[PDB]
Design an enzyme around this catalytic site. Structure first.
Site, PDB file in Angstrom:
ATOM      1  N   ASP A 139       7.273   0.648  -8.711  1.00  0.00           N
ATOM      2  CA  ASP A 139       6.812   2.117  -8.251  1.00  0.00           C
ATOM      3  C   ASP A 139       7.458   2.341  -7.001  1.00  0.00           C
ATOM      4  OD1 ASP A 139       5.493   0.065  -7.068  1.00  0.00           O
ATOM      5  OD2 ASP A 139       3.460   1.016  -7.724  1.00  0.00           O
ATOM      6  N   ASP A 172      -0.767  -6.497  -0.254  1.00  0.00           N
ATOM      7  CA  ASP A 172      -1.444  -7.038  -1.773  1.00  0.00           C
ATOM      8  C   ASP A 172      -1.811  -8.575  -1.603  1.00  0.00           C
ATOM      9  OD1 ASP A 172      -1.492  -4.540  -2.195  1.00  0.00           O
ATOM     10  OD2 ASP A 172      -0.164  -4.299  -3.697  1.00  0.00           O
TER      11      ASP A 172
HETATM   12  O1  LIG Z   1      -4.377   9.639   1.190  1.00  0.00           O
HETATM   13  C1  LIG Z   1      -4.023   8.403   1.685  1.00  0.00           C
HETATM   14  C2  LIG Z   1      -4.702   7.602   0.421  1.00  0.00           C
HETATM   15  O2  LIG Z   1      -3.548   6.621  -0.007  1.00  0.00           O
HETATM   16  C3  LIG Z   1      -4.208   5.491  -0.621  1.00  0.00           C
HETATM   17  O3  LIG Z   1      -3.169   4.409  -1.211  1.00  0.00           O
HETATM   18  C4  LIG Z   1      -2.387   4.896  -2.331  1.00  0.00           C
HETATM   19  C5  LIG Z   1      -0.932   5.401  -1.750  1.00  0.00           C
HETATM   20  O4  LIG Z   1      -0.709   4.383  -0.736  1.00  0.00           O
HETATM   21  C6  LIG Z   1       0.547   4.736  -0.315  1.00  0.00           C
HETATM   22  C7  LIG Z   1       1.236   3.329   0.111  1.00  0.00           C
HETATM   23  O5  LIG Z   1       1.706   2.630  -1.416  1.00  0.00           O
HETATM   24  C8  LIG Z   1       2.583   1.450  -1.072  1.00  0.00           C
HETATM   25  O6  LIG Z   1       2.910   0.866  -2.151  1.00  0.00           O
HETATM   26  C9  LIG Z   1       1.812   0.345  -2.832  1.00  0.00           C
HETATM   27  C10 LIG Z   1       1.921   0.508  -4.216  1.00  0.00           C
HETATM   28  O7  LIG Z   1       1.600   1.799  -4.343  1.00  0.00           O
HETATM   29  C11 LIG Z   1       0.988  -0.047  -5.270  1.00  0.00           C
HETATM   30  O8  LIG Z   1       1.101   0.070  -6.596  1.00  0.00           O
HETATM   31  C12 LIG Z   1       0.921  -1.702  -4.832  1.00  0.00           C
HETATM   32  O9  LIG Z   1      -0.095  -2.404  -5.569  1.00  0.00           O
HETATM   33  O10 LIG Z   1       0.934  -2.204  -3.413  1.00  0.00           O
HETATM   34  C13 LIG Z   1       2.157  -1.276  -2.623  1.00  0.00           C
HETATM   35  C14 LIG Z   1       2.093  -1.922  -1.480  1.00  0.00           C
HETATM   36  O11 LIG Z   1       0.869  -1.527  -0.658  1.00  0.00           O
HETATM   37  C15 LIG Z   1       0.628  -2.482   0.350  1.00  0.00           C
HETATM   38  O12 LIG Z   1       1.446  -2.832   1.373  1.00  0.00           O
HETATM   39  C16 LIG Z   1       1.895  -1.818   2.222  1.00  0.00           C
HETATM   40  C17 LIG Z   1       0.581  -1.213   2.921  1.00  0.00           C
HETATM   41  O13 LIG Z   1       0.844  -0.145   3.334  1.00  0.00           O
HETATM   42  C18 LIG Z   1      -0.466  -0.785   1.816  1.00  0.00           C
HETATM   43  O14 LIG Z   1      -1.773  -0.533   2.397  1.00  0.00           O
HETATM   44  C19 LIG Z   1      -0.695  -2.194   0.901  1.00  0.00           C
HETATM   45  O15 LIG Z   1      -1.743  -2.024   0.055  1.00  0.00           O
HETATM   46  C20 LIG Z   1       3.633   1.777   0.175  1.00  0.00           C
HETATM   47  O16 LIG Z   1       4.297   0.470   0.396  1.00  0.00           O
HETATM   48  C21 LIG Z   1       3.395   2.240   1.061  1.00  0.00           C
HETATM   49  O17 LIG Z   1       4.368   2.674   2.010  1.00  0.00           O
HETATM   50  C22 LIG Z   1       2.453   3.476   1.149  1.00  0.00           C
HETATM   51  O18 LIG Z   1       1.886   4.035   2.299  1.00  0.00           O
HETATM   52  O19 LIG Z   1      -0.162   5.757  -2.743  1.00  0.00           O
HETATM   53  C23 LIG Z   1       0.323   4.645  -3.619  1.00  0.00           C
HETATM   54  C24 LIG Z   1      -1.271   4.206  -4.408  1.00  0.00           C
HETATM   55  O20 LIG Z   1      -0.959   2.919  -5.142  1.00  0.00           O
HETATM   56  C25 LIG Z   1      -2.083   3.929  -3.279  1.00  0.00           C
HETATM   57  O21 LIG Z   1      -3.417   3.450  -3.944  1.00  0.00           O
HETATM   58  C26 LIG Z   1      -5.437   4.961  -0.310  1.00  0.00           C
HETATM   59  O22 LIG Z   1      -6.210   4.142  -1.466  1.00  0.00           O
HETATM   60  C27 LIG Z   1      -6.526   5.902   0.317  1.00  0.00           C
HETATM   61  O23 LIG Z   1      -7.537   5.136   0.988  1.00  0.00           O
HETATM   62  C28 LIG Z   1      -5.710   6.691   0.894  1.00  0.00           C
HETATM   63  O24 LIG Z   1      -5.272   6.227   2.156  1.00  0.00           O
END
Ligand SMILES: OC[C@H]1O[C@@H](O[C@H]2[C@@H](OC[C@H]3O[C@@H](O[C@H]4[C@H](O)[C@@H](O)[C@H](O)O[C@@H]4CO[C@H]4OC[C@@H](O)[C@H](O)[C@H]4O)[C@H](O)[C@@H](O)[C@@H]3O)OC[C@@H](O)[C@@H]2O)[C@H](O)[C@@H](O)[C@H]1O
Ligand SMILES: [Cl-]
Length: 747
Positions: free
Chosen positions: A38, A445
């Site tokens: 992703d 994560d």
């Molecule tokens: O309205 C905002 C909304 O966002 C919700 O989170 C969803 C959103 O997150 C954006 C971030 O996605 C990261 O990539 C994820 C990936 O999507 C997942 O599949 C995987 O499990 O983990 C990666 C990495 O995420 C971790 O490392 C970076 C850190 O920033 C994260 O907090 C951490 O969990 C990208 O790396 C980031 O650049 C991006 O900002 O879109 C993807 C969804 O999978 C997310 O669930 C959030 O839940 C909600 O509260 C709210 O903030």
């Protein structure tokens, strides 16, 4: 404009550490496999070494969104050809996506921009595949789009794309209508040709399409895509995750009441006979026996009445894989209850390739460690080997080479099959100047690791505290065994868990202090940024929610800092333990009383990364004091909106900075061992210098810069973390957002 050849290698985690929503087997050439992620691009399988090779590392700074791989198709007529639908977000965080095409299995790419956004990191990304090649006429491709853009097609091998305006349903389901993430239509879910309705050189006439619409989700065209109808008598109320057509003429469909990857509290599995139109419910569990969607769906090509489905998500005690060898009439579970709470297992877990996958916890029947998985949206059986399974979880790729042991009273040996995959997002890096570890990472994560041999997976997960995401880590420069990390504890699972961890032995063992920052009304949830005084006699914690706090008691007590606004970036002087630095909204600050009070300096021209039209990963602030030199600070960041963008240097504790005129743009700064014959440490920067975006090193305090990466090693939006190595000249460690951590030396 200069460059120096470097060898770029991954810091090995063994598991990858991220979500793999798609694994795609070629239907013609055995052992041709692709994996899509992703946020970290895609990979191609190498059978001779049982490892994955990235086909996405040429993705760079401007085209970073190509590493969101929403769909991938591998050509069954010419297996050298592969295509991807890329683009990361469909909301305001991203621009339009594209279809990418390759004639050399992903070694090189050409790209065609799309007039809309692609959502490689949006809900429903494990549904698919949404990009497919006509198996009888491989110049024809179909793409099922998001947000209401509907069905698109190509008849010139993906070079140009047109809307199929006759497709009747662009989607109705929206995961989060009230949030700014996922408030758009999920759209189309999967596309499946019926190869028997064409011959080699003639377009396939029957196409099935799944749509994210609980009222009408499965569609068919029988005249080559001109006219479309909903299948009569189809079930309603759920969202089809995959639709796979067996050679017996049966279309198998997994359903969830969400699109995933995190939800799914009800599910069904159906089979539809293409000849009679008959629908048959073959759900492994129904009623109160079912509390989860069905996601992954794998047909056995060599045994067309064998199929498997995975839960999405059952959660407790683990997920379940169901296997049927009679077309779904009866199912066998991969585990069963024995005498409660004891369970029986038809599988064995092998995580010797990534021992940290046990999260430091011993396994029990009700709390397995490692779990079989989670977010199991993609389940695969090798079409040329019924004994080979592969599936993606939120953390790795698992697989087996003796799957049919299931059928003969044996155990399926499941092992990590993610060698060569690195998918973590890097939030911080430190290279300790002493001890056996040259690199400690702060990761999303999976928390992060203290690495020793950068080619060997870590054996130890970070515990006490144990959390998902370390947001920041720092160490006492003058006592580098003293070390602090901050994340966000899950206090609903472990209400005694704290969001800060402290180590006295260089990160081999952590402990949790007695208290956390609190404003009387509320204790911090954590995250933010942490800085440790030069001597280790104090800690500065810029929390994510309640502002800046300091501790002179190693976390036994916290007191709110004055004069520094909440959300400020912070950094400690590496020599003077009384000296901390701060930055917020264009204003630089300095503290000389251990972080208790801050005063603004007159430093001018610094960007206020406050602008309106900025995507979440577009701008950055990188501020670090130099080891061994009090009051020497480098500052990188900014944006093109404000025309405040580049690399600054202060040698008067931030009273004033000089902006380097030879650095057009800069986003990160880091320090490494001084070059031979030099006294000042080498600089490492993510920057645009002399018209070239990349990674640069300077051995002369920024007078001249040499590019140390190249166009084949860019890793998308690398504004995450960078540092050199104080013991190894030339060595750089580079964080990424989806490609893990890299390290590189001159060749
Ligand atoms: O309205 C905002 C909304 O966002 C919700 O989170 C969803 C959103 O997150 C954006 C971030 O996605 C990261 O990539 C994820 C990936 O999507 C997942 O599949 C995987 O499990 O983990 C990666 C990495 O995420 C971790 O490392 C970076 C850190 O920033 C994260 O907090 C951490 O969990 C990208 O790396 C980031 O650049 C991006 O900002 O879109 C993807 C969804 O999978 C997310 O669930 C959030 O839940 C909600 O509260 C709210 O903030
Ligand atoms: Cl955890």
């Amino acid at each position: 404009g200069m460059s120096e050849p470097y060898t770029w290698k991954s810091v090995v985690t063994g598991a990858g550490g991220g979500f793999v929503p798609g694994i795609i087997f070629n239907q013609t050439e055995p052992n041709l496999i692709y994996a899509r992620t992703d946020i970290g691009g895609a990979y191609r399988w190498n059978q001779a070494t049982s490892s994955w090779v990235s086909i996405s590392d040429s993705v760079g700074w401007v085209d970073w969104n190509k590493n969101g791989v929403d769909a991938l198709a591998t050509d069954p007529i010419d297996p050298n050809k592969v295509y991807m639908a890329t683009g990361t977000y469909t909301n305001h965080w991203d621009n339009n996506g594209q279809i990418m095409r390759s004639n050399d299995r992903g070694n090189t790419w050409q790209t065609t921009p799309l007039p809309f956004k692609v959502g490689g990191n949006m809900p429903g990304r494990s549904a698919g595949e949404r990009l497919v090649i006509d198996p009888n006429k491989n110049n024809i491709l179909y793409f099922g789009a998001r947000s209401g853009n509907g069905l698109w097609k190509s008849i010139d091998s993906g070079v140009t794309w047109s809307k199929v305006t006759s497709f009747p349903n662009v989607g109705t389901y929206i995961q989060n209508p009230t949030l700014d993430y996922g408030n758009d239509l999920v759209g189309l879910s999967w596309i499946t040709f019926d190869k028997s309705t064409g011959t080699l050189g003639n377009a396939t006439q029957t196409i099935y399409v799944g749509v994210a619409d609980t009222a009408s989700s499965v569609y068919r065209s029988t005249d080559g895509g001109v006219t479309w109808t909903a299948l009569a008598g189809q079930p309603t109320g759920f969202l089809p995750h995959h639709g796979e057509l067996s050679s017996t003429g049966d279309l198998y469909i997994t359903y969830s009441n969400g699109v995933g990857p995190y939800d799914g509290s009800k599910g069904e599995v159906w089979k539809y006979n293409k000849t009679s139109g008959a629908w048959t419910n073959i759900s492994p569990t129904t009623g109160t026996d079912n509390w989860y969607g069905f996601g992954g769906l794998a047909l056995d090509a060599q045994h067309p009445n064998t199929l498997m489905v995975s839960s999405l998500n059952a959660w407790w005690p683990d997920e379940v894989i169901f296997r049927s060898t009679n077309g779904g009439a009866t199912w066998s579970r991969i585990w069963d209850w024995g005498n409660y709470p004891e369970r029986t297992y038809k599988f064995s877990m092998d995580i010797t390739a990534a021992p940290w996958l046990d999260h430091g916890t011993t396994s029990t029947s009700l709390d397995p460690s490692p779990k079989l998985g989670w977010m199991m949206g993609d389940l695969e059986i090798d079409p040329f080997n019924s004994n080979r399974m592969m599936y993606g979880t939120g953390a790795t790729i698992y697989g087996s080479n003796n799957l049919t042991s299931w059928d003969t009273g044996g155990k399926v040996n499941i092992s990590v099959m993610a060698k060569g995959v690195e998918e973590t997002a890097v939030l911080g890096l430190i290279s300790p100047p002493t001890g056996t570890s040259h690199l400690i990472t702060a990761l999303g994560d999976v928390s992060g690791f203290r690495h020793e041999d950068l080619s060997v997976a870590p054996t130890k997960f970070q515990t006490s505290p144990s959390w998902a995401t370390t947001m920041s880590i720092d160490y006492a420069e003058l006592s580098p065994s003293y070390m602090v990390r901050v994340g966000s504890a899950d206090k609903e699972k472990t209400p005694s868990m704290k969001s800060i961890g402290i180590s006295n032995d260089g990160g081999v063992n952590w402990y949790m202090p007695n208290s956390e920052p609190s404003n009387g009304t509320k204790t911090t949830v954590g995250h933010g940024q942490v800085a440790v005084s030069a001597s280790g006699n104090s800690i500065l914690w810029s929390t994510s929610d309640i502002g800046v706090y300091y501790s002179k008691t190693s976390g036994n007590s916290w007191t709110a800092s004055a004069g520094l606004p909440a959300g400020a970036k912070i950094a400690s002087d590496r020599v003077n333990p009384n000296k901390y630095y701060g930055f917020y909204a264009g204003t630089f600050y300095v503290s000389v009383d251990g972080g208790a009070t801050f005063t603004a300096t007159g430093a001018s021209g610094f960007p206020t990364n406050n602008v309106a039209g900025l995507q979440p990963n577009e701008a950055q602030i990188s501020m670090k004091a130099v080891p061994g030199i009090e009051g020497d600070i480098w500052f990188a960041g900014g944006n093109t909106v404000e025309n405040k963008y580049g690399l600054w240097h202060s040698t008067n504790s931030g009273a004033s900075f000089t902006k380097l005129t030879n650095v057009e743009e800069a986003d990160l700064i880091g320090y490494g061992k001084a070059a031979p014959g030099q006294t000042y440490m080498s600089l490492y920067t993510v920057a645009k210098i002399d018209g070239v975006r990349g990674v640069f090193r300077s051995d002369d305090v920024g007078a001249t810069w040499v590019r140390i990466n190249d166009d084949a090693h860019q890793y998308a939006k690398i504004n995450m973390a960078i540092t050199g190595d104080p013991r190894i000249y030339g060595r750089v460690y580079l964080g990424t957002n989806g490609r893990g951590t890299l390290y590189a030396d001159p060749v």
